[PDB]
Scaffold this active site. Structure first.
Site, PDB file in Angstrom:
ATOM      1  N   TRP A 174     -12.456   9.558   3.630  1.00 45.06           N
ATOM      2  CA  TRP A 174     -12.102  10.355   4.803  1.00 45.06           C
ATOM      3  C   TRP A 174     -12.073  11.813   4.369  1.00 45.06           C
ATOM      4  CZ3 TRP A 174      -6.841  11.972   6.859  1.00 45.06           C
ATOM      5  CH2 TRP A 174      -6.891  12.236   8.237  1.00 45.06           C
ATOM      6  N   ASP A 234      -2.092   5.804   2.552  1.00 44.02           N
ATOM      7  CA  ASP A 234      -2.376   6.434   3.825  1.00 44.02           C
ATOM      8  C   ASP A 234      -2.490   5.239   4.767  1.00 44.02           C
ATOM      9  OD1 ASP A 234      -3.360   7.684   6.101  1.00 44.02           O
ATOM     10  OD2 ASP A 234      -4.919   8.789   5.072  1.00 44.02           O
ATOM     11  N   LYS A 256      -2.937   5.628  16.495  1.00 40.12           N
ATOM     12  CA  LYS A 256      -3.832   4.565  16.920  1.00 40.12           C
ATOM     13  C   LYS A 256      -3.200   3.262  17.420  1.00 40.12           C
ATOM     14  CE  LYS A 256      -6.493   7.225  13.887  1.00 40.12           C
ATOM     15  NZ  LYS A 256      -6.500   7.408  12.439  1.00 40.12           N
TER      16      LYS A 256
HETATM   17  C1  LIG Z   1      -6.337   8.631  11.866  1.00 37.71           C
HETATM   18  C2  LIG Z   1      -6.192   8.725  10.488  1.00 37.71           C
HETATM   19  C3  LIG Z   1      -5.119   9.421   9.931  1.00 37.71           C
HETATM   20  C4  LIG Z   1      -4.036  10.109  10.797  1.00 37.71           C
HETATM   21  O1  LIG Z   1      -4.278  10.587  12.127  1.00 37.71           O
HETATM   22  P1  LIG Z   1      -3.115  11.389  12.840  1.00 37.71           P
HETATM   23  O2  LIG Z   1      -3.742  11.608  14.312  1.00 37.71           O
HETATM   24  O3  LIG Z   1      -2.964  12.679  12.143  1.00 37.71           O
HETATM   25  O4  LIG Z   1      -1.930  10.534  12.972  1.00 37.71           O
HETATM   26  C5  LIG Z   1      -4.999   9.479   8.575  1.00 37.71           C
HETATM   27  N1  LIG Z   1      -5.908   8.845   7.786  1.00 37.71           N
HETATM   28  C6  LIG Z   1      -6.947   8.169   8.324  1.00 37.71           C
HETATM   29  C7  LIG Z   1      -7.910   7.458   7.415  1.00 37.71           C
HETATM   30  C8  LIG Z   1      -7.101   8.106   9.652  1.00 37.71           C
HETATM   31  O5  LIG Z   1      -8.152   7.425  10.160  1.00 37.71           O
END
Ligand SMILES: *Cc1c(COP(=O)(O)O)cnc(C)c1O
Ligand SMILES: *Cc1c(COP(=O)(O)O)cnc(C)c1O
Lengths: 396, 396
Positions: free
Chosen positions: B130, B211, B246
Site C-alpha cells: 500500500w 495495519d 470499511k
Molecule cells: C483503508 C486502509 C487503511 C485506512 O483507511 P482510513 O480511511 O484512513 O481508515 C489503512 N491501510 C490499508 C491497507 C487500507 O486499505
C-alpha cells in the site's frame, strides 16, 4: 523498545481535565479550559446544530471519503465569513481553504507545510500567549520566538513594546496574530493599530499567520474580522487557521480550516497542492460530521438566523458574568481593583492572580484555573459566582 | 514566500478521485478506491449506523472536548475485537488504545511516536503493498525498506522469499504486517505461517506493527484476528493501527485506533503518555461522531446483531461478484485464466493487468482502476459487469 521512554510533561491547559476527574470533592468549580457554559453550568449543543444534525440524519445517503480538502461548500462559506461576501481574494481566486480537524489541526498542517516547502526557520508568537502554539511549531521543526504584547501594570496592549520586539523579526519569518479575543489577555489591537501592524508587516517582509478561534465573541462576526481584512487588503500572501469549536460549540467534532493566500490563483493552487500532500500524509481527509453541520447552518437562511442569535446570547451571558464577577468581588471586599476585567474580550479573565494563588485555589477551595492566572469567565454562573468570589478574596 | 513551490505529485490511489470528476463520459466504471458498493453501485450508510445516529441525535447533550485518547468505551470495545473478550493483554492492562482520525491517522501518530521516543530508524513494508505506508513513514523521518511477499507467476504468498528478505531486518526495526485482506494481493499467511512469523519475529527482535483495516472482510471478525493474536501471545511489545472505515462504512467520519502494547502497565502507561503528546501536537483530540456510532453499535446487543449481519452481506456480495467476474470473463472469451481471483481475500482483484492495460482501460473505455492493476471488486455490480468484462477482454 519502550523500556527507556520517559513520562511526558502534562499539558498546562488540557491537563486540567485529568486533575478535575481525580478530585472527589463535590463543589469543584472548573474555570480552566475555554468552553462555554450556560446558566446551569453545562456546555450544551446549540439548537441550530441539533436542527442541522436532524437534517443530516434524514438527508445523508453516503459516508464516502471527503476528498483531501474536505467539503467544498464548507470552505467557500468560511472564506466569506473571514474575508467578506465580496472580497477580492475570493473573486480573484487567490484563496484556497482546506477543512481540518479543529483549529489545532490547521496550525499543524500549516506548520508541516511551511517546514517542508518554505525557507521559514522561525515563527513569532506573543507573550503572554497560548502554550500550544510553541508545541505545535516546535514539533514541526520550526523555532519559536516571542514578541512583547501585554502591559501588566496597566492592563493594556503595550504597542510600543510590541513593535520594538518585532523589529527583531527578519523578512521571511512568520508572525502569528490572534484574530480577536487574544488568548489569554483578552486585549486586541484597534483597527488603527491593526493597520499600522499591516503596513509594518508588508514593509518588513513578514509572512502573517492568523489564528482565528473566537470570531463573534468580541464584538461580532464582521467586526472581529476587521484586523484580518486589513492585512488581507495589503498582503500578497498569508495563512489563516480558524476554528468552529467555540462559536458553534462543536468542540469534539474537530471543525476547523486552513486557508492559504497567494499573489494569484496559479501560485495558490501550486502551493495548495503541497498543503494537500501534508494533509494526506497525516490523516488523509477530514471528519465530515462537524463540517457538514456548519455548512448546513451557514447555508440555510433560517438556520443561520437561529445560529447567530445563539452566538449573540453566548457573548452576552459572558459580558454579564464578568460585570457581575467584578461586582461580587468588591461586594466581598477584595483589596485589589479588578475593573479592568470588563475591558477584556472573549471568555477569560487574566491578570489578577499569581501561580501560587491559583495553586492554592485548586488545593484549598477546589477551584480550577490555568497556572497563568487565566480564568474562564464563561464557566462562571449565578450559582458558583458567590463561592468562587469568596475563594478568590481569601487568596488575595 | 510561495513563488518557488512546485506542484506535488498526485496520489496513485486518492488521485483517481480527481481523474473521475474531470471525465465527462457517462459510462465511467470506478473500480479504484477500495470502498464498498451495493448492487445499485452506491456506497450506502449502514442501517445499524443510521440507527445509532438516531440514538445519538436524541441522547447526546454536550459536544465538549473528548480527552486526548478519545472515548474510553470505544477503546475498550476495540481491544476486545482485536484481542478477544478474555485476552491476557486486556486483563494484565498491558494495552492502551487511542481513538484516531481513521487508520491513516493511527499510522501517523505511531510513526511520530516511534521517531521521537524510540531508536527505530527503519520500517519494513511488503512489496506489492500500500503506497501510503511509505509516504506516512518517510514523512516522520523513518526510512522504509521493502520485503518480498508475492509470487506473481503462481499467485501465492512467496513465503520463502518473505523470510529471505526479512533476514535483512535487524533487531530494533519495525516490520509492518497487514492484519488480513492484504492490500493489494489479497493473499494472507495461514495460521501456521503467522505462527512461524511470530516466533521468527520474537527471536529476531523486530517490533511488529499491524495495519488492521479490513477485519471481517476475509473470513470473519474472530478468524481475521488470528494472526494478530498469535503475535500478541508471543510478543512483549507491539503496535496495531485499525480502521472502521470499511467494516462500518464510516469512511468520511475518520474512525480508527492506535493501540500500544508493552511488557506491563507501568511501561505501557509511560509510553502512552508520549503517544498522547504526539497526538496533542497534531489535532489535539479526535472527532467524536464516528467513534460514538461504533461504540453505540458495538455496545448494544441488538445493534451489534444488525451490524454483524450487514458486514456478512457485504463480504458475501463481494465473494459472489468475483466468482461472477471470472465467469463473465471466460464467457466473453478471455485468453488468460483469472480463476486465481477467487482465492483473494478482501475487496480487490490483483495480478492480471499491466500499467498500460489499466491506462488504456481508463482512456478508451473509461474504466478506472489503480495503475498497479488493482481493481475494486466491491465496485462491481450486475449492471456494470458485462461492459467491464468487454473492456478487459479487449485489452488482454
Ligand atoms: C483503508 C486502509 C487503511 C485506512 O483507511 P482510513 O480511511 O484512513 O481508515 C489503512 N491501510 C490499508 C491497507 C487500507 O486499505
Ligand atoms: C481554541 C483555540 C484554538 C483551537 O481549538 P480547536 O478545538 O482545536 O478548534 C486555537 N487557538 C486558540 C487561541 C484557541 O483558544
Amino acid at each position: 523498545m519502550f523500556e527507556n521512554i520517559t513520562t511526558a510533561p502534562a499539558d498546562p491547559i488540557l491537563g486540567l481535565a485529568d486533575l478535575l476527574r481525580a478530585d472527589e470533592r463535590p463543589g469543584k468549580i472548573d474555570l480552566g479550559m475555554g468552553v462555554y457554559n450556560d446558566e446551569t453550568g453545562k456546555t450544551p449543543v446549540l439548537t441550530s446544530v441539533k436542527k442541522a444534525e436532524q437534517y443530516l440524519l434524514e438527508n445523508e445517503t453516503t459516508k464516502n471519503y471527503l476528498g483531501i480538502d474536505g467539503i467544498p461548500e464548507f470552505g467557500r462559506c468560511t472564506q466569506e465569513l473571514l474575508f467578506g461576501k465580496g472580497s477580492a481574494l475570493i473573486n480573484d481566486k487567490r484563496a484556497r481553504t482546506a477543512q481540518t480537524p479543529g483549529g489545532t489541526g490547521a496550525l499543524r498542517v500549516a506548520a508541516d507545510f511551511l517546514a517542508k516547502n518554505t525557507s521559514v526557520r522561525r515563527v513569532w508568537v506573543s507573550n503572554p500567549g497560548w502554550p500550544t502554539h510553541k508545541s505545535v511549531f516546535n514539533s514541526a521543526g520550526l523555532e519559536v520566538r516571542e514578541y512583547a504584547y501585554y502591559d501588566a501594570e496597566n492592563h493594556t496592549l503595550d504597542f510600543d513594546a510590541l513593535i520594538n520586539s518585532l523589529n527583531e523579526a527578519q523578512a521571511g519569518d512568520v508572525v502569528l496574530f490572534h484574530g480577536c479575543c487574544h488568548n489569554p489577555t483578552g486585549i486586541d489591537p484597534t483597527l488603527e493599530q491593526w493597520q499600522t501592524l499591516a503596513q509594518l508587516s508588508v514593509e518588513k517582509g513578514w509572512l502573517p499567520l492568523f489564528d482565528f478561534a473566537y470570531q463573534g465573541f468580541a464584538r461580532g462576526l464582521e467586526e472581529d474580522a476587521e484586523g484580518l481584512r486589513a492585512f488581507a487588503a495589503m498582503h500578497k500572501e498569508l495563512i489563516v487557521a480558524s476554528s468552529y469549536s467555540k462559536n458553534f460549540g462543536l468542540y469534539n467534532e474537530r471543525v476547523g480550516t486552513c486557508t492559504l493566500v497567494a499573489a494569484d490563483s496559479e501560485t495558490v493552487d501550486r502551493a495548495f497542492s503541497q498543503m494537500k500532500a501534508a494533509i494526506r500524509v497525516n490523516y488523509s481527509s477530514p471528519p465530515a460530521h462537524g463540517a457538514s453541520v456548519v455548512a448546513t447552518i451557514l447555508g440555510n437562511d433560517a438556520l443561520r438566523a437561529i445560529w447567530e442569535q445563539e452566538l449573540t446570547d453566548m457573548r452576552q451571558r459572558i459580558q454579564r458574568m464578568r460585570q457581575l464577577f467584578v461586582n461580587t468581588l468588591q461586594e466581598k471586599g477584595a483589596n485589589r481593583d479588578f475593573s479592568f476585567t470588563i475591558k477584556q474580550n472573549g471568555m477569560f479573565f487574566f491578570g489578577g492572580l499569581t501561580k501560587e494563588q491559583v495553586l492554592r485555589l485548586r488545593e484549598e477551595f477546589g477551584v480550577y484555573a490555568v497556572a497563568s492566572g487565566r480564568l474562564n469567565v464563561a464557566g462562571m454562573t449565578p450559582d458558583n459566582l458567590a463561592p468562587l468570589c469568596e475563594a478568590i478574596v481569601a487568596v488575595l
